Amino acid sequence: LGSETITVPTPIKQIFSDDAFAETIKDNLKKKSVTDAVTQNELNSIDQIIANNSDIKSVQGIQYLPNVTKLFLNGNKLTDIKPLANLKNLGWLFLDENKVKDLSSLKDLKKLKSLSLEHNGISDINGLVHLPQLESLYLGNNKITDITVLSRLTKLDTLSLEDNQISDIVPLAGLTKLQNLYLSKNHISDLRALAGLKNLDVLELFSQECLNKPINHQSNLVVPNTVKNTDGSLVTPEIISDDGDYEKPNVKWHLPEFTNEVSFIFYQPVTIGKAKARFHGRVTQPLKE
Which CB atom, from 30 or from 258, has the smaller least distance to Zn ion? 258
Q: Please list every residue from 104 through 123 that binds Zn ion, using CB under 5 A.
A: 104, 107
Which CB atom, from 111 or from 254, has the smaller least distance to Zn ion? 254
φ, ψ dihedrals at 82, nearest 5°: -60, -30
Q: How far apart are CA 273 and CA 39, in angstroms?
A: 53
Which CB atom, from 231 or from 243, has the smaller least distance to Zn ion? 243
User: Which amino acid is present at 164?
Assistant: N
We find the least distance from the C-beta atom of residue 189 to Zn ion, in angstroms, to be 16
> For residues 48-69, b (16+ Cβ closer than 10 Å) or e, as one string?
ebebeebebbbbbbbbbbbebb
Q: First-to-last CA distance in the chain?
A: 66
Q: Please list every residue from 87 through 106 that binds Zn ion, using CB under 5 A.
A: 104
**Pattern of binders to Zn ion over 214-253, x per CB under 5 A?**
-----------------------------x----------
We find the least distance from the C-beta atom of residue 102 to Zn ion, in angstroms, to be 9
Which CB atom, from 7 or from 219, has the smaller least distance to Zn ion? 219
Residue, CB closest to Zn ion: 243
Q: How far apart are CA 151 and CA 288, in angstroms?
A: 38
φ, ψ dihedrals at 270, nearest 5°: -120, 150
Which CB atom, from 104 or from 176, has the smaller least distance to Zn ion? 104
We find the least distance from the C-beta atom of residue 46 to Zn ion, in angstroms, to be 28
Question: If you compute the radius of gyration of the chain from its CA atoms, what whole number of angstroms results?
Answer: 25
Which CB atom, from 26 or from 282, has the smaller least distance to Zn ion? 282
Where would I find the beta strands (DSSP E) of 73-154? 92-94, 114-116, 136-138
| Secondary structure element (H or E) that encloses residue 14, with its range | helix 12-15
We find the least distance from the C-beta atom of residue 103 to Zn ion, in angstroms, to be 8
Q: Please list every residue from 116 through 175 that binds Zn ion, using CB under 5 A.
A: none
We find the least distance from the C-beta atom of residue 209 to Zn ion, in angstroms, to be 13
Q: How far apart are CA 178 and CA 176, in angstroms?
A: 5
Q: How far apart are CA 246 and CA 237, in angstroms?
A: 8
We find the least distance from the C-beta atom of residue 75 to Zn ion, in angstroms, to be 26
Q: Please list every residue from 6 through 45 that binds Zn ion, using CB under 5 A.
A: none
SS3 15: helix
**Residue count, binding to Zn ion (CB under 5 A):** 3
The residue ranges that bind Zn ion (CB under 5 A) are 104, 107, 243
